[PDB]
Amino acid sequence: TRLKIVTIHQEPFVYVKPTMSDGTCKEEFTVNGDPVKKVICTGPNTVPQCCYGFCIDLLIKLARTMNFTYEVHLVADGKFGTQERVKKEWNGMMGELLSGQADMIVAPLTINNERAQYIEFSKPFKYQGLTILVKKGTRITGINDPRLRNPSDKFIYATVKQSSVDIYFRRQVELSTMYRHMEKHNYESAAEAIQAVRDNKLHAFIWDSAVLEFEASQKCDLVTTGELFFRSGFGIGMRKDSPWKQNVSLSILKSHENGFMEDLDKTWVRY
Amino acid sequence: NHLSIVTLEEAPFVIVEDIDPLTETCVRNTVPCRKFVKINNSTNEGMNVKKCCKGFCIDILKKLSRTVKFTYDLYLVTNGKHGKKVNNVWNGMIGEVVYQRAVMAVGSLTINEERSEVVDFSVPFVETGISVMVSRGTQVTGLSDKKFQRPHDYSPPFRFGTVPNGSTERNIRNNYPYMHQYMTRFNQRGVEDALVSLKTGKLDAFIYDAAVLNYKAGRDEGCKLVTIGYIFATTGYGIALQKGSPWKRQIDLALLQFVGDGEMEELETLWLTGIC
Ligand SMILES: N[C@@H](CCC(=O)O)C(=O)O
């Protein structure tokens, strides 16, 4: 009866830290003194860890609103989810949701046609899009820059494996040239790619603007390359026959309308 | 497969034009859309006038009709506008769907909680919400600005309003009781009247649908009117369908399909982007 929530590490929506020696999460507060709500989330390094952030505050609100109990865990393979040929199969959180390993996905999960065919997405809890992250000084126009459209081993760019971005470039035939170049450099996680950009190991990282804008605001040695493309949103994910789907969406709408969503933004992003 | 669909005029999403007297057929990028017009005010007698419709949402309907494979009979709502619940009864486009006179409503229809309780909405296909329009340089944070929250705290009070009966007024009514009660004095009959009041200095700010305000700012003569910042209560326009409708599934997949393929951006540059 307790809902199994699956999530993924992705700051500032989901932070993941080790518990304390006694197995609990360290008590922390925001800049002005509000308690940072944390939940114990199990996952591979399987051990108990601490989770918190935008998406965690949203889960707590949804759970209290619809009155349900839950247990949270980090996606076993560390991926968002794509469908690959083997018959086809889903990996990441998509696979876990579809197999019953999870009853709901609460993360910065991009709503797209490919996934909507198999699961139910709530109305967006966040509207954003894709942008490009580079090291301060790197001169790139946008997704139309020649260094991207006419690739070479001189300027490497990539995205995260088994992600909505991977699906996007693999779907659009007009992006075929970029797709082939990225297929040889994509990273296992956003954190790693970002670190690679700082270490001049990666020249450009194509990812979610909600995440990249945040990173660029915390690390002044990194910047985003103008012009947002592939505008998209994040939604809660559930199986199509979930009895919580209607109330989950109504709750998201309510939160946008009464300012709750804006408060999370002031708390975790715009700071 | 032949569906009754309701819409409402609101440039650039839905624009209405008179049909050619000698031909009685819609040409160019327009599609047929009828409107029930009363004969007089002493009777219920009326007649459907054949007109033509075009715009961002009409292009969306055309794409959907083709990909999802359905035909339609498009008509313009005459009992209210977008949708308001009066004495527990929905009017406007929402009402037409609720009481089953239309299978769906297509247009600049904002998705919000109370409406989603009586109709089903497709995924959002145009991002919107609540924005504020003012003359360039005007200093206002946003809706939470004290000039809006506590109007009478300033000598000459700030003068601002919206077009009543839509999702925007509903939101302000629920979130800011004082602001709402104060605003009624400045209700504008429509967007056009509002812009005129702004340009002539009869109003200081106009609070309304973000997508329409951005479109208007993009074509303002002299680029004097701009939107502040920002979008409060981000949401989007959505196609409204009857609860449990069998059309929702394919409609959603198609819309998401269009977004991913860039078809939405083309329509955006074609209908929404302006000189400013
Ligand atoms: N799009 C709005 C109309 C304009 C507004 O109130 O902002 C609605 O569907 O009610």
Coordinates of C-alpha atoms and ligand atoms in Angstrom, one line a residue:
Chain A
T1 CA 0.0 0.0 0.0
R2 CA 3.1 2.2 0.4
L3 CA 4.1 3.7 -3.0
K4 CA 7.5 3.0 -4.3
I5 CA 9.0 6.2 -5.7
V6 CA 12.0 6.0 -8.0
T7 CA 14.2 9.1 -8.6
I8 CA 17.6 10.0 -9.9
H9 CA 20.5 12.2 -8.8
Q10 CA 20.2 15.5 -10.6
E11 CA 20.9 18.8 -8.9
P12 CA 19.0 21.0 -8.0
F13 CA 16.0 18.8 -8.3
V14 CA 17.5 15.8 -6.4
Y15 CA 20.6 16.0 -4.2
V16 CA 22.0 12.7 -2.9
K17 CA 24.3 12.6 0.2
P18 CA 25.5 9.8 2.5
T19 CA 23.6 9.4 5.8
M20 CA 25.3 10.2 9.1
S21 CA 27.1 7.5 11.2
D22 CA 23.8 6.9 13.0
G23 CA 22.0 6.3 9.8
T24 CA 20.0 9.5 9.7
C25 CA 20.2 12.7 7.5
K26 CA 22.0 15.7 8.8
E27 CA 19.7 18.5 9.9
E28 CA 20.2 21.5 7.5
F29 CA 18.6 24.9 6.9
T30 CA 18.2 27.3 4.0
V31 CA 20.0 30.6 4.0
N32 CA 17.3 32.4 6.0
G33 CA 16.5 29.5 8.4
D34 CA 13.9 27.2 7.0
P35 CA 14.3 23.4 7.6
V36 CA 15.5 21.5 4.6
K37 CA 13.2 18.5 4.3
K38 CA 15.1 15.2 3.6
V39 CA 14.1 11.6 3.0
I40 CA 16.1 8.4 3.2
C41 CA 16.5 7.0 -0.3
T42 CA 18.1 3.6 -1.0
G43 CA 20.4 3.1 -4.0
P44 CA 23.7 1.8 -5.3
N45 CA 27.1 3.4 -4.5
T46 CA 22.5 -0.8 -2.2
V47 CA 22.6 1.4 0.9
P48 CA 20.5 4.1 2.6
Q49 CA 21.3 7.6 1.6
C50 CA 19.9 11.1 1.9
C51 CA 17.7 12.8 -0.8
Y52 CA 16.3 16.3 -1.0
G53 CA 15.7 19.2 -3.4
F54 CA 13.0 20.6 -5.7
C55 CA 11.5 17.2 -6.7
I56 CA 11.7 15.9 -3.1
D57 CA 9.7 18.9 -1.8
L58 CA 7.2 18.2 -4.6
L59 CA 6.8 14.5 -3.6
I60 CA 6.2 15.5 0.1
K61 CA 3.5 17.9 -1.1
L62 CA 1.8 15.4 -3.4
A63 CA 2.0 12.7 -0.7
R64 CA 0.4 14.9 2.0
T65 CA -2.2 16.2 -0.5
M66 CA -3.4 12.9 -1.9
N67 CA -2.7 11.3 1.5
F68 CA -0.4 8.4 0.6
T69 CA 2.8 6.9 2.1
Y70 CA 5.9 6.1 0.2
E71 CA 9.5 4.7 0.0
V72 CA 12.1 6.3 -2.2
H73 CA 15.0 4.7 -4.1
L74 CA 17.5 5.8 -6.7
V75 CA 17.2 4.1 -10.2
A76 CA 19.4 1.0 -10.2
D77 CA 21.2 1.6 -13.6
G78 CA 21.4 5.4 -13.0
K79 CA 19.6 6.4 -16.2
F80 CA 16.4 8.3 -17.1
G81 CA 15.2 5.9 -19.7
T82 CA 15.1 5.0 -23.4
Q83 CA 13.8 2.1 -25.5
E84 CA 16.5 0.0 -27.1
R85 CA 16.3 -3.0 -29.5
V86 CA 17.4 -6.3 -28.1
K87 CA 11.9 -7.0 -29.3
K88 CA 12.4 -3.6 -27.6
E89 CA 12.9 -2.8 -23.9
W90 CA 13.0 0.2 -21.6
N91 CA 15.9 1.0 -19.3
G92 CA 16.4 3.6 -16.5
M93 CA 13.4 4.9 -14.6
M94 CA 11.1 4.1 -17.5
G95 CA 12.0 0.4 -17.3
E96 CA 11.6 0.4 -13.5
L97 CA 8.2 2.0 -13.7
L98 CA 6.9 -0.4 -16.3
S99 CA 8.2 -3.5 -14.5
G100 CA 6.6 -2.6 -11.2
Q101 CA 9.9 -1.9 -9.4
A102 CA 8.5 1.6 -9.0
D103 CA 4.9 2.9 -8.8
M104 CA 5.7 6.5 -9.6
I105 CA 8.6 8.5 -11.1
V106 CA 9.4 11.7 -9.3
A107 CA 12.3 13.5 -11.0
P108 CA 13.1 15.9 -13.8
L109 CA 11.7 13.5 -16.3
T110 CA 11.1 15.0 -19.8
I111 CA 7.6 14.4 -21.2
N112 CA 8.0 13.2 -24.8
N113 CA 6.0 11.2 -27.5
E114 CA 8.2 8.1 -27.2
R115 CA 7.6 7.7 -23.4
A116 CA 3.9 8.9 -23.5
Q117 CA 3.1 5.9 -25.6
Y118 CA 3.8 3.6 -22.7
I119 CA 3.3 5.6 -19.5
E120 CA 1.1 8.4 -18.1
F121 CA 2.7 11.9 -17.6
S122 CA 1.1 14.5 -15.3
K123 CA 0.7 18.0 -16.6
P124 CA 4.2 19.7 -16.5
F125 CA 5.5 20.7 -13.1
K126 CA 8.2 22.7 -14.8
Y127 CA 8.5 24.2 -18.3
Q128 CA 12.0 24.5 -19.8
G129 CA 14.0 23.3 -22.8
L130 CA 17.5 22.3 -24.1
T131 CA 20.5 24.5 -24.2
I132 CA 24.3 24.2 -24.4
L133 CA 26.9 24.4 -21.6
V134 CA 30.5 25.4 -22.4
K135 CA 33.6 26.7 -20.6
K136 CA 33.6 30.5 -20.3
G137 CA 35.3 31.8 -23.4
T138 CA 34.2 29.1 -25.8
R139 CA 32.5 30.9 -28.8
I140 CA 29.5 28.9 -30.1
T141 CA 26.4 30.4 -31.8
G142 CA 23.9 27.7 -30.9
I143 CA 22.6 24.4 -32.2
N144 CA 23.2 25.9 -35.7
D145 CA 26.9 26.6 -35.2
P146 CA 29.2 25.0 -37.9
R147 CA 31.3 23.4 -35.1
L148 CA 28.2 21.3 -34.3
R149 CA 26.6 20.8 -37.7
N150 CA 29.9 20.0 -39.4
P151 CA 31.6 18.0 -36.6
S152 CA 35.3 17.0 -36.3
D153 CA 37.5 15.5 -33.6
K154 CA 38.7 19.1 -32.9
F155 CA 35.5 20.2 -31.1
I156 CA 33.8 17.4 -29.0
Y157 CA 30.3 17.7 -27.8
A158 CA 27.9 15.3 -26.2
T159 CA 24.9 14.6 -23.9
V160 CA 23.9 12.0 -21.4
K161 CA 23.4 8.4 -22.5
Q162 CA 19.9 6.9 -22.4
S163 CA 18.3 10.3 -21.9
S164 CA 15.5 12.3 -23.5
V165 CA 18.2 14.3 -25.3
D166 CA 19.6 11.1 -26.8
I167 CA 16.1 10.2 -28.0
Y168 CA 15.7 13.7 -29.5
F169 CA 18.9 13.7 -31.6
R170 CA 18.4 10.0 -32.7
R171 CA 14.8 10.8 -33.8
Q172 CA 15.4 13.8 -36.0
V173 CA 17.0 12.8 -39.3
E174 CA 18.2 16.4 -39.7
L175 CA 20.3 15.9 -36.6
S176 CA 21.8 12.7 -37.8
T177 CA 25.3 14.2 -38.3
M178 CA 25.3 15.5 -34.7
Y179 CA 23.9 12.2 -33.4
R180 CA 26.8 10.2 -34.9
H181 CA 29.3 12.5 -33.4
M182 CA 27.7 12.4 -29.9
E183 CA 27.3 8.6 -30.0
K184 CA 31.1 8.4 -29.5
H185 CA 31.3 10.8 -26.6
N186 CA 28.1 10.6 -24.5
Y187 CA 28.5 10.4 -20.7
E188 CA 26.9 8.1 -18.1
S189 CA 25.5 11.0 -16.1
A190 CA 25.0 14.8 -16.2
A191 CA 27.4 15.4 -13.3
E192 CA 30.3 13.6 -15.1
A193 CA 29.8 15.5 -18.4
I194 CA 29.7 18.8 -16.6
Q195 CA 32.9 18.0 -14.8
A196 CA 34.4 17.1 -18.1
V197 CA 33.6 20.5 -19.5
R198 CA 35.4 22.2 -16.5
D199 CA 38.4 19.9 -17.2
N200 CA 38.5 20.8 -20.9
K201 CA 37.8 17.1 -21.7
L202 CA 34.4 18.0 -23.3
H203 CA 33.9 21.2 -25.2
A204 CA 30.1 21.4 -25.1
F205 CA 27.4 19.7 -23.1
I206 CA 23.8 19.6 -24.6
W207 CA 21.3 19.2 -21.7
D208 CA 18.2 20.5 -19.9
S209 CA 18.2 24.3 -19.5
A210 CA 16.7 24.0 -16.0
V211 CA 19.8 22.1 -14.9
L212 CA 22.5 23.9 -17.0
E213 CA 21.2 27.4 -16.1
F214 CA 21.5 26.3 -12.5
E215 CA 25.1 24.9 -12.9
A216 CA 26.1 28.1 -14.7
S217 CA 24.8 30.1 -11.8
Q218 CA 26.9 28.2 -9.3
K219 CA 30.1 27.7 -11.3
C220 CA 31.3 30.9 -13.0
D221 CA 33.8 29.1 -15.2
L222 CA 30.8 27.5 -17.1
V223 CA 28.3 29.3 -19.3
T224 CA 25.3 28.5 -21.5
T225 CA 25.3 29.0 -25.3
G226 CA 22.4 31.1 -26.4
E227 CA 19.0 30.1 -27.9
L228 CA 16.8 27.5 -26.3
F229 CA 15.6 24.7 -28.5
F230 CA 13.3 21.7 -28.2
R231 CA 11.1 23.4 -25.6
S232 CA 9.8 20.7 -23.2
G233 CA 8.6 20.1 -19.7
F234 CA 9.1 17.7 -16.8
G235 CA 6.2 15.6 -15.5
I236 CA 5.4 13.0 -12.9
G237 CA 5.4 9.5 -14.4
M238 CA 2.9 6.7 -13.6
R239 CA 1.6 3.5 -15.3
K240 CA -1.4 4.2 -17.5
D241 CA -3.8 2.5 -15.1
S242 CA -2.6 4.3 -12.0
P243 CA -5.5 5.4 -9.8
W244 CA -3.5 8.5 -8.7
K245 CA -3.0 10.0 -12.2
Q246 CA -6.0 12.4 -12.1
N247 CA -5.3 13.8 -8.6
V248 CA -1.6 14.0 -9.3
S249 CA -2.2 16.4 -12.3
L250 CA -4.9 18.4 -10.4
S251 CA -2.4 18.9 -7.6
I252 CA 0.4 20.1 -10.0
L253 CA -2.0 22.6 -11.6
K254 CA -3.1 23.8 -8.1
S255 CA 0.6 24.3 -7.1
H256 CA 1.4 26.4 -10.2
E257 CA -1.8 28.5 -9.6
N258 CA -1.3 29.1 -5.8
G259 CA 2.4 29.9 -6.0
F260 CA 3.8 26.8 -4.5
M261 CA 5.7 25.9 -7.6
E262 CA 7.2 29.4 -7.7
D263 CA 8.3 29.0 -4.0
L264 CA 10.2 25.8 -4.9
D265 CA 11.9 27.8 -7.7
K266 CA 13.0 30.6 -5.3
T267 CA 14.1 27.9 -2.9
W268 CA 16.1 25.6 -5.2
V269 CA 16.8 27.4 -8.4
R270 CA 16.6 31.2 -8.6
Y271 CA 18.9 31.9 -5.6
Chain B
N1 CA -15.0 10.6 -37.2
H2 CA -16.9 13.8 -38.0
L3 CA -16.6 16.0 -34.9
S4 CA -18.3 19.1 -33.7
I5 CA -15.6 21.5 -32.6
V6 CA -16.0 24.9 -30.9
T7 CA -13.5 27.8 -31.0
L8 CA -13.4 31.5 -30.2
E9 CA -11.7 34.4 -31.9
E10 CA -8.5 35.8 -30.3
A11 CA -5.6 36.8 -32.6
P12 CA -3.2 35.4 -33.5
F13 CA -4.5 32.0 -32.3
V14 CA -7.9 32.2 -34.0
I15 CA -8.8 35.0 -36.4
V16 CA -12.2 35.3 -38.1
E17 CA -12.9 36.8 -41.6
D18 CA -16.0 37.3 -43.7
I19 CA -16.5 34.7 -46.4
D20 CA -16.6 35.6 -50.1
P21 CA -20.2 36.6 -51.0
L22 CA -19.7 35.3 -54.6
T23 CA -18.4 31.8 -53.9
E24 CA -19.3 31.2 -50.3
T25 CA -16.1 29.2 -50.0
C26 CA -13.1 29.7 -47.8
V27 CA -9.7 30.0 -49.6
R28 CA -6.0 30.4 -48.7
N29 CA -5.1 29.0 -45.3
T30 CA -8.6 29.4 -43.8
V31 CA -11.1 26.8 -42.9
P32 CA -15.0 27.0 -42.6
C33 CA -16.4 28.2 -39.3
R34 CA -20.0 29.1 -38.5
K35 CA -21.5 31.5 -36.0
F36 CA -25.1 31.6 -34.7
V37 CA -26.4 35.1 -35.1
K38 CA -29.7 36.4 -33.5
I39 CA -32.4 38.0 -35.7
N40 CA -33.4 40.4 -32.9
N41 CA -33.6 40.6 -29.1
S42 CA -37.3 39.8 -28.8
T43 CA -37.0 36.3 -30.1
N44 CA -34.8 33.2 -29.9
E45 CA -34.7 33.0 -33.7
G46 CA -31.3 33.0 -35.3
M47 CA -29.2 31.8 -38.2
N48 CA -25.8 30.3 -38.7
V49 CA -23.5 32.6 -40.7
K50 CA -20.8 30.9 -42.7
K51 CA -17.4 32.5 -42.0
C52 CA -13.7 31.6 -42.4
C53 CA -11.1 31.0 -39.6
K54 CA -7.3 31.0 -39.6
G55 CA -4.4 31.3 -37.1
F56 CA -2.0 29.4 -34.9
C57 CA -4.7 27.1 -33.4
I58 CA -6.4 26.6 -36.7
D59 CA -3.1 25.3 -38.2
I60 CA -2.9 23.0 -35.2
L61 CA -6.4 21.7 -35.8
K62 CA -5.6 21.2 -39.5
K63 CA -2.5 19.2 -38.5
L64 CA -4.4 17.1 -36.0
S65 CA -7.3 16.5 -38.3
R66 CA -4.9 15.0 -40.8
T67 CA -2.6 13.0 -38.5
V68 CA -5.4 11.8 -36.2
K69 CA -7.7 11.3 -39.2
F70 CA -11.0 13.0 -38.4
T71 CA -13.2 15.6 -40.1
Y72 CA -15.0 18.4 -38.3
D73 CA -17.7 21.1 -38.2
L74 CA -16.1 24.2 -36.6
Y75 CA -18.3 26.7 -34.9
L76 CA -17.8 29.9 -32.8
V77 CA -19.1 30.0 -29.2
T78 CA -21.8 32.5 -28.5
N79 CA -22.8 31.8 -24.9
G80 CA -19.8 33.4 -23.1
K81 CA -16.1 33.2 -24.1
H82 CA -13.3 31.0 -22.9
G83 CA -15.2 29.6 -19.9
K84 CA -16.6 30.7 -16.5
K85 CA -18.6 28.9 -13.9
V86 CA -21.6 31.0 -13.0
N87 CA -24.0 29.8 -10.3
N88 CA -22.3 26.4 -10.7
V89 CA -22.9 26.2 -14.5
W90 CA -20.1 26.5 -17.0
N91 CA -20.5 28.8 -20.0
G92 CA -18.1 29.5 -22.9
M93 CA -16.0 27.0 -24.7
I94 CA -15.7 24.9 -21.6
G95 CA -19.5 24.8 -21.2
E96 CA -19.9 23.7 -24.8
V97 CA -17.7 20.7 -24.1
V98 CA -19.2 19.9 -20.6
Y99 CA -22.8 19.9 -22.0
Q100 CA -21.7 17.9 -25.0
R101 CA -22.4 20.3 -27.9
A102 CA -18.8 19.9 -29.0
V103 CA -16.4 17.0 -28.9
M104 CA -13.5 19.4 -28.2
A105 CA -12.6 23.1 -27.9
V106 CA -9.7 24.5 -29.8
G107 CA -8.3 27.9 -29.2
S108 CA -6.5 30.1 -26.7
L109 CA -8.0 28.0 -23.9
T110 CA -6.0 28.1 -20.7
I111 CA -5.5 24.9 -18.7
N112 CA -6.3 25.3 -15.0
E113 CA -7.4 23.2 -12.0
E114 CA -11.2 24.0 -11.9
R115 CA -11.6 23.5 -15.6
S116 CA -9.7 20.2 -15.5
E117 CA -12.4 19.0 -13.0
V118 CA -15.1 19.1 -15.7
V119 CA -13.2 18.5 -18.9
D120 CA -10.1 16.6 -20.0
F121 CA -7.2 18.6 -21.4
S122 CA -4.6 17.5 -23.9
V123 CA -0.9 18.1 -23.1
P124 CA -0.2 21.9 -23.4
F125 CA 0.7 23.0 -26.9
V126 CA 1.4 26.7 -26.3
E127 CA 3.2 27.9 -23.1
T128 CA 1.4 30.6 -21.3
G129 CA 0.4 31.9 -17.8
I130 CA -0.1 35.3 -16.3
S131 CA 2.0 38.3 -17.4
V132 CA 1.9 42.0 -16.9
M133 CA 2.2 44.6 -19.7
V134 CA 3.4 48.2 -19.0
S135 CA 5.1 51.0 -20.7
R136 CA 8.9 50.3 -21.0
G137 CA 10.7 51.3 -17.9
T138 CA 7.8 50.9 -15.5
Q139 CA 9.1 49.5 -12.2
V140 CA 7.1 46.5 -11.1
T141 CA 8.4 43.2 -9.8
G142 CA 5.4 41.2 -10.8
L143 CA 2.0 40.2 -9.4
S144 CA 3.4 40.2 -5.9
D145 CA 4.6 43.8 -6.3
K146 CA 3.2 45.9 -3.4
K147 CA 1.8 48.3 -6.0
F148 CA -0.5 45.5 -6.9
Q149 CA -1.0 43.9 -3.5
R150 CA -1.6 47.1 -1.5
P151 CA -2.7 49.7 -4.1
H152 CA -3.8 52.3 -1.6
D153 CA -0.4 52.4 0.0
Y154 CA 0.7 54.8 -2.8
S155 CA -0.5 58.4 -3.3
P156 CA -1.8 58.3 -6.8
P157 CA -2.7 54.6 -6.7
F158 CA -1.4 52.3 -9.5
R159 CA -4.1 51.9 -12.1
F160 CA -4.4 48.3 -13.5
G161 CA -6.9 45.7 -14.6
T162 CA -7.6 42.7 -16.7
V163 CA -10.4 41.5 -19.0
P164 CA -12.9 39.8 -16.6
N165 CA -14.3 36.3 -16.6
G166 CA -11.2 34.4 -17.8
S167 CA -8.6 32.2 -16.2
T168 CA -6.5 35.3 -15.2
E169 CA -9.3 37.0 -13.2
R170 CA -10.2 33.7 -11.6
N171 CA -6.6 33.3 -10.4
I172 CA -6.3 36.8 -9.0
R173 CA -9.7 36.4 -7.3
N174 CA -8.4 33.3 -5.5
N175 CA -4.9 34.5 -4.7
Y176 CA -5.2 38.2 -4.0
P177 CA -8.6 39.2 -2.5
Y178 CA -7.8 42.9 -2.0
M179 CA -6.1 43.3 -5.4
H180 CA -9.0 41.7 -7.1
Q181 CA -11.6 43.8 -5.4
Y182 CA -9.6 46.9 -6.2
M183 CA -9.1 46.0 -9.9
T184 CA -12.8 45.6 -10.9
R185 CA -12.9 49.4 -11.3
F186 CA -10.4 49.0 -14.1
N187 CA -12.0 46.0 -15.9
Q188 CA -11.3 46.3 -19.7
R189 CA -13.9 45.0 -22.2
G190 CA -11.1 43.4 -24.2
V191 CA -7.4 43.4 -25.1
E192 CA -7.8 46.1 -27.7
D193 CA -9.5 48.5 -25.4
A194 CA -6.8 47.7 -22.8
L195 CA -3.9 48.5 -25.1
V196 CA -5.5 51.8 -25.9
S197 CA -5.9 52.7 -22.2
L198 CA -2.2 51.8 -21.7
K199 CA -0.9 53.8 -24.6
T200 CA -3.0 56.8 -23.7
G201 CA -2.0 56.8 -20.1
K202 CA -5.4 55.8 -18.7
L203 CA -4.0 52.6 -17.2
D204 CA -0.5 51.8 -15.7
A205 CA -0.5 48.0 -16.2
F206 CA -2.6 45.3 -17.9
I207 CA -2.6 41.8 -16.4
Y208 CA -3.5 39.1 -18.9
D209 CA -2.7 35.8 -20.6
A210 CA 1.1 35.7 -21.3
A211 CA 1.1 34.3 -24.8
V212 CA -1.3 37.1 -26.0
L213 CA 0.6 39.8 -24.2
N214 CA 4.0 38.6 -25.7
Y215 CA 2.4 38.6 -29.2
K216 CA 1.0 42.1 -28.6
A217 CA 4.4 43.5 -27.3
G218 CA 6.1 42.0 -30.3
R219 CA 4.1 44.2 -32.7
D220 CA 3.5 47.3 -30.6
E221 CA 3.9 50.5 -32.7
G222 CA 7.1 52.0 -31.5
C223 CA 7.8 49.0 -29.2
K224 CA 6.6 51.1 -26.2
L225 CA 4.6 48.3 -24.5
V226 CA 6.5 45.4 -23.0
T227 CA 5.9 42.5 -20.6
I228 CA 7.7 42.7 -17.2
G229 CA 10.7 40.5 -16.4
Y230 CA 8.2 36.7 -16.3
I231 CA 5.2 34.3 -16.2
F232 CA 3.2 33.6 -13.0
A233 CA 1.4 30.2 -12.7
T234 CA 3.0 28.7 -15.8
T235 CA 0.6 26.5 -17.7
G236 CA -0.4 26.3 -21.3
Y237 CA -3.2 26.3 -23.8
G238 CA -4.8 22.9 -24.2
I239 CA -7.5 21.2 -26.3
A240 CA -10.4 20.6 -24.0
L241 CA -12.3 17.3 -24.5
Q242 CA -15.2 15.6 -22.8
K243 CA -14.1 13.6 -19.7
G244 CA -13.1 10.1 -20.7
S245 CA -13.0 11.1 -24.3
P246 CA -11.5 8.4 -26.7
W247 CA -9.8 11.2 -28.7
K248 CA -7.5 12.4 -26.0
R249 CA -4.9 9.6 -26.4
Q250 CA -4.1 10.1 -30.1
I251 CA -4.4 13.9 -29.8
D252 CA -1.7 14.0 -27.1
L253 CA 0.7 11.7 -29.0
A254 CA 0.3 13.9 -32.1
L255 CA 0.9 17.2 -30.3
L256 CA 4.0 15.8 -28.6
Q257 CA 4.9 14.4 -32.1
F258 CA 4.7 17.9 -33.6
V259 CA 6.7 19.6 -30.8
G260 CA 9.6 17.1 -31.2
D261 CA 9.7 17.6 -35.0
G262 CA 9.8 21.4 -34.8
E263 CA 6.4 21.9 -36.4
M264 CA 5.5 24.1 -33.4
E265 CA 8.5 26.4 -33.9
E266 CA 7.6 27.0 -37.5
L267 CA 4.0 27.9 -36.5
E268 CA 5.6 30.1 -33.8
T269 CA 7.7 32.1 -36.3
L270 CA 4.8 32.2 -38.7
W271 CA 2.1 33.5 -36.3
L272 CA 3.7 34.7 -33.1
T273 CA 7.0 36.4 -33.5
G274 CA 7.1 40.2 -34.1
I275 CA 9.3 43.1 -35.1
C276 CA 10.0 44.3 -31.5
Ligands
LIG1 N1 -6.8 32.2 -22.1 C1 -7.7 32.7 -21.0 C2 -8.4 34.0 -21.5 C3 -7.6 35.3 -21.2 C4 -7.2 35.5 -19.7 O1 -8.1 35.5 -18.8 O2 -6.0 35.5 -19.4 C5 -8.8 31.7 -20.7 O3 -8.8 30.6 -21.3 O4 -9.6 32.0 -19.8

